[PDB]
Design a protein around this ligand. Structure first.
Ligand code: CA
Lengths: 95, 192, 96, 337, 359, 48, 42, 96, 48
């Protein structure tokens, strides 16, 4: 008399969750990212992960997918100027 | 299979000029496929091929080289090409002049795996068992002073030298094949 | 494509081995004998006692003392090659 | 084949000390890893016969440090086979801002740094403290090379004049384009909460997560790290992850009041659920341990498949680091007790 | 037809420029360099073509072993001892365990005769004896299996000074020119080699009687500096050295392999996204830096993903040391299909018939 | 010996039922290696 | 479309050995002789 | 595998004549290339361990005439394994 | 493509084995022994 066990293996990949309304990929800038409710205010975020036990210290590695761009401009001979921007989190300094 | 046995190539028109023309290479007067010991560091790919030849070949085969090197697409690179048939190799051997106990040993007096193997023929086994003496160790806590040898190996392809100003393949009828400073006179050719 | 396997509708084509429908026979490289030796290293072995030469005045090689003072009197020694069975290797794998 | 390639890389807790031979007491040395002995009977010829299973013990051992690593084998052979090797490498440039920048006439200053730590610039298929063993590296010289298209002077001057207007600037963006966070998971723990204080969320794109071993993640920023004794493959840098199957579930919340998926767009509306234990509502799929919602979400996010019936995507849309390429389901039967 | 004008210049200018460094700073860990790039008048430089150039010396350490198994008597059985001698207390006697393969002509005081000089005037009948340094060697032996069981047998055996090791993986460097191992002792210099000779005759057969107990086996003994560079013992009978009879049975096994090599795609060789040491690219008129780097922008993984996205990855480029790392598919997921062993598989004896009988 | 040929006797024997049939082997190893199994399949729709 | 058609007789010769190894008593040891008898002096 | 597939194709100047056998004197006949003898110690197992390095002597030897030339053995087994063969070929037109 | 073989024109490119021109000698895996036993199972015997 026997019992059954099932499992799956999936390496060389990262788990993805998109911030889109229908989960599809309709462009670089998802429609929810432009929604007024998430754009003209502030909100707090809470996440809860449940994993399986292991017998050594480990790390949970999270990637917030954002926009990161740089613009480079050089008016006169021997001059380089740049402007960096990361939209959801930070951009240089102020004042 | 014998492409890898070239050293240098020199072109000369009218016995006064050199075809690469005005200074345009690391070695302006002539191309240089491979070379022996060179302290200036003109080699690439850990093999012993100079940068100039690698750049010329890449330009002539795939128009790659003025915007960085990267693997060409599969369809643009067929079986009789340069990149698919490029093999760099290297090894280490025992230096003699810097190792104290070097002793040249012929094949006659080499007993390794003795007592379970033939003797200079595929015949039956013979001999006692005894510690071995052929392969000098190159690893472990008791290695020996060693030197390095490097070579490159390429087959099933022809070296190419295109007749253009910037070596690119801009078309069938190359521009340098039209200029009346190179296409409205008579010239004689020497090569070495 | 059809080579790849999808494990949801059991989508996995059934193909034979191209080397079993058509047997491209070529023999097997067996230029060298593949021998098998004893476990100790020597099989047959005899028994021997040490001896030593004498002062050797002249034609005294016949005079020969026993060196039993130092060496034991039952040292073991083998003569000639060692015991060795033989098996052709690649032929058996191919035949199986 | 079985004994070597499996039984010599079992976890260290299943072995035992040898007899009448000296063994080093440092658990991170070649000597200790070499001297320990392992009973063959664990992985003999009769194990899991007929089943497409993987040893449960060896399901968390980093499989990219193994003497079958084609890339590692090729690189090691390429460098040499000796022990005292000269080397003549060439290094590219990786920063996204100036990787493809088209410079203009002038005179610029260009300065960079380099590492001399032995662990961080070498990789060993075994994984051992390379400071203790005694590897060494000595740089000798350094130079810089560059190549110019020999373009005609009129054309080059015209291009230079055009590329200096205040509207023909240049732009670049990092391909990954994300911000990273690392949270510690203490040994044997199972629940990890993360809180982010109020801020703006314009032009968000999504989340992407995985798991890592603390022993193989060098500390960020700090130039040196004397408490770092490991030289295997580092997933955090070259991207070789091997622990995505240990997650169980994820829950999201906004303003501590509303769950993000909100409307019932999932089978379990209030939370994603990757895999289930033995549970009989009949949800799992692909004859494996994964539910339906997660499968649908992954297929959508990777290939826009899921609203028209699943199928195998085309090769050109399915690269090496994708999802469907390396998704393996497996099952077996064992003796009830 | 290709374009003919306003593409390529005519004034002499280089295709490839090389810049030497201007400033170098060294430290225990970091190593910093600074150069002065100069894009000349009326040119355009594409940074995607630039690349650093480094060289030097590397010492991979004493735990490098790229080959599995060993390479010193691989075919030898895993427990066969070398021809050796050891001491034993009954006040102490020597025991020998060796093997003499070579067949000579006759044994005299000088040593095992091997050949003869030329049958010529003033040279006819001149015996030739073995050279003590290298002549009776462990390679030659009886040719065919119909051996005649010669009476003049010779060979070698390591004195009791050298410790005993299993034959599997045992190496000892040559000293003389003719590949004959033997320690060159310092005696009035390193000129002389110490090789002794020992004789043996049949016990039983020459016990009761004498017959001048002629000898039949000659063993030339030596002493070599042996060492096992890549194998280790897997069963050692007793903890102590000073080889005895028991130590004849120890067995060895090879060392696990390592593949220490430079990391794939040159990861870690340059500092990225670290405020401690940040790269600088700027205009020489005023040092306004143009490389602002945070501590969260992960560059290496991004470059890996990009290099996968824009091209193929299953090919190897040597120039950037670019070769992805992967595991064998079968190692991670076993597929136990047993084997295929319907037929037996036997090893017959050399002659063809083993035991025989007289008729 | 030395010829590329297929045995006459086995040309008319169905070569798709054989213990090297990759599809059969894969499906059987996917369902389990036992003798009593619970199964949880999903069947598509195939009419035109 | 056109292509020449040719037929005839070919004789590769006496030095044409497609298979490697041998094909007679393959498993036998490399030295074992057949059951044989010979003549000899006293 | 090493001994056969490499040592049988070493340059001729490294092989010595056998003993008590009749060997032809024309250096092109199959007999001369067959009855020569090459010492197996040249390319034994302990050769360039760990190094991905082609041999030195066997570098200018043509590697296409070799009994693992897949195309060649295919074209050989296409006609048959016998000795006398009727052949029925077709030939295309190659001029440009 | 050229790898595929067309019989009619006798079209079959000739190539050398990749592992014959360039030897990648990694040694061999021989951790375990490998023993040949006696047919009966017990070789020698006695009397009791
Ligand atoms: Ca006796």
């Amino acid at each position: 008399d026997s019992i059954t066990q099932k499992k799956f293996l999936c390496d060389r990949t990262l788990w993805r969750i998109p911030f889109s309304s229908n989960f599809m990929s309709m462009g670089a800038l998802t429609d929810l990212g432009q929604n007024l409710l998430y754009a003209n205010s502030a909100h707090a975020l809470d996440m809860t992960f449940e994993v399986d036990p292991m017998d050594e210290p480990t790390l949970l590695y999270v990637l917030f997918e954002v926009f990161d761009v740089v613009r480079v401009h050089q008016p006169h001979r021997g001059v380089i100027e740049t402007v960096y921007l990361r939209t959801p989190f930070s951009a240089g300094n102020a004042t | 299979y014998l492409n890898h046995t070239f050293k240098k190539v020199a072109i000369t028109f009218d016995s006064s000029v050199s075809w690469p023309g005005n200074d345009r290479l690391l070695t302006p007067n002539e191309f240089e496929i491979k070379r022996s010991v060179d302290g200036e560091g003109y080699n690439v790919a850990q093999c012993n091929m100079t940068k100039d030849w690698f750049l010329v070949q890449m330009l002539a085969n795939y128009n790659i080289g003025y915007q960085g090197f990267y693997i060409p697409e599969s369809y643009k690179d067929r079986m009789y090409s340069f990149f698919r048939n490029f093999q760099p190799m290297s090894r280490q051997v025992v230096d003699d002049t810097k190792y104290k106990d070097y002793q040249q040993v012929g094949i006659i007096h080499q007993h390794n795996n003795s007592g379970f193997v033939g003797y200079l023929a595929p015949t039956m086994r013979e001999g006692q068992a005894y510690p071995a003496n052929v392969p000098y160790p190159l690893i472990g806590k008791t290695a020996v002073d060693s030197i390095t040898q490097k070579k490159f190996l390429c087959d099933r392809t022809l070296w190419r030298i295109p007749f253009s100003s910037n070596f690119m393949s801009m078309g069938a009828l190359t521009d340098l094949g039209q200029n009346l400073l190179y296409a409205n006179s008579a010239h004689a050719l020497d090569m070495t | 494509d059809r080579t790849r396997y999808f494990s949801m509708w059991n989508q996995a084509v059934d193909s034979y081995d191209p080397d079993v429908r058509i047997i491209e026979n070529h023999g097997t490289e067996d230029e060298l004998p593949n021998y098998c030796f004893p476990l100790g290293g020597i099989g047959i072995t005899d028994t021997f006692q040490a001896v030593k030469t004498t002062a050797a005045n002249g034609d005294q090689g016949n005079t020969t003392w026993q060196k039993d003072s130092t060496f034991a009197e039952r040292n073991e020694i083998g003569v000639g090659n060692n015991f060795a069975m033989e098996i052709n290797l690649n032929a058996n794998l191919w035949r199986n | 084949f079985l004994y070597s390639n499996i039984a010599l890389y079992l976890p260290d807790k299943l072995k035992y000390n040898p007899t009448n031979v000296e063994i080093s007491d440092n658990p991170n040395t070649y000597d200790y890893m070499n001297k320990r002995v392992v009973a063959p009977g664990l992985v003999d010829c009769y194990i899991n016969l007929g089943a497409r299973w993987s040893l449960e013990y060896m399901d968390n051992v980093n499989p990219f440090n193994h003497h079958r690593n084609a890339g590692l084998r090729y690189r090691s052979m390429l460098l040499g086979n000796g022990r005292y090797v000269p080397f003549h490498i060439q290094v590219p440039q990786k920063f996204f801002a100036i990787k493809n920048l088209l410079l203009l006439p002038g005179s610029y200053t260009y300065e960079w740094n380099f590492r001399k730590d032995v662990n961080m610039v070498l990789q060993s298929s075994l994984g051992n403290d390379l400071r203790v063993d005694g590897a060494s590296i000595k740089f000798d010289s350094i130079c810089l090379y560059a190549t110019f298209f020999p373009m005609a002077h009129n054309t080059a001057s015209t291009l230079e004049a055009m590329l200096r207007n205040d509207t023909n600037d240049q732009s670049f963006n990092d391909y990954l384009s994300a911000a990273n966070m690392l949270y510690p998971i203490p040994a044997n723990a199972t629940n990890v909460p993360i809180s982010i204080p109020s801020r703006n969320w314009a032009a968000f794109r999504g989340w992407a997560f995985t798991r890592l071993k603390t022993k193989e993640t060098p500390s960020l920023g700090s130039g040196y790290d004397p408490y770092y004794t490991y030289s295997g493959s580092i997933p955090y840098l070259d991207g070789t992850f091997y622990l995505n199957h240990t997650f169980k579930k994820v829950a999201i919340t906004f303003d501590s009041s509303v769950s993000w998926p909100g409307n019932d767009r999932l089978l379990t509306p209030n939370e994603f659920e990757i895999k289930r234990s033995v549970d009989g509502e009949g949800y799992n799929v692909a004859q494996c341990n994964m539910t339906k919602d997660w499968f649908l979400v992954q297929m959508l996010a990777n290939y826009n498949i899921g609203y028209q019936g699943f199928y195998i995507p085309e090769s050109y849309k399915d690269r090496m680091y994708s999802f469907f390429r390396n998704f393996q389901p497996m099952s077996r039967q064992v003796v009830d007790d | 037809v290709a374009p003919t004008h306003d593409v390529t210049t005519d004034r002499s200018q280089r295709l490839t420029l090389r810049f030497i460094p201007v400033d170098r700073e060294d430290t225990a860990y970091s190593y910093k360099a600074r150069f002065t790039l100069a894009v000349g008048d009326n040119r355009v430089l594409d940074m995607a073509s630039t690349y650093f150039d480094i060289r030097g010396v590397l010492d991979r350490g004493p735990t490098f072993k790229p080959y599995s198994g060993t390479a010193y008597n691989a075919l030898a059985p895993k427990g066969a001892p070398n021809s050796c001698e050891w001491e034993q207390n009954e006040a102490k006697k020597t025991h020998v365990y060796a093997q003499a393969p070579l067949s000579g002509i006759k044994i005299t005081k000088e040593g095992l005769q091997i050949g003869t000089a030329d049958a010529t005037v003033a040279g006819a009948g001149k015996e030739i004896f073995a050279d003590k340094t290298f002549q009776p060697e462990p390679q030659v032996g009886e040719s065919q299996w119909n051996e005649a069981d010669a009476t003049a047998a010779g060979g070698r055996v390591l004195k009791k000074t050298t410790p005993m090791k299993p034959c599997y993986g045992s190496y000892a460097r040559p000293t003389n020119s003719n590949g004959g191992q033997g320690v060159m002792v310092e005696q009035n210099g390193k000129l002389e080699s110490q090789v002794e000779m020992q004789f043996f005759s049949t016990s039983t057969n020459a016990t009761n009687e004498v017959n001048n107990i002629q000898p039949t086996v000659v063993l030339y003994s030596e002493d070599v500096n042996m060492e096992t560079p890549d194998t280790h013992l897997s069963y050692k009978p007793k903890m102590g050295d000073k080889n005895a009879k028991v130590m004849l049975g120890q067995q060895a096994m090879p060392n696990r392999p390592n593949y220490i090599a430079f990391r794939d795609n040159f990861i870690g060789l340059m500092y990225y996204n670290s405020t401690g040491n940040m790269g600088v690219l700027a205009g020489q008129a005023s040092q306004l830096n143009a490389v602002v780097d945070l501590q969260d922008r992960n560059t290496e993984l991004s470059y890996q993903l990009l290099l996968d996205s824009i091209g193929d990855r299953t090919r190897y480029f040597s120039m950037w040391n670019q070769a992805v790392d992967s595991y064998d598919p079968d190692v991670r997921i076993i597929e136990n299909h047993g084997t295929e062993d319907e037929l037996p598989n036997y090893c017959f004896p050399l002659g063809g018939i083993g035991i025989t009988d007289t008729f």
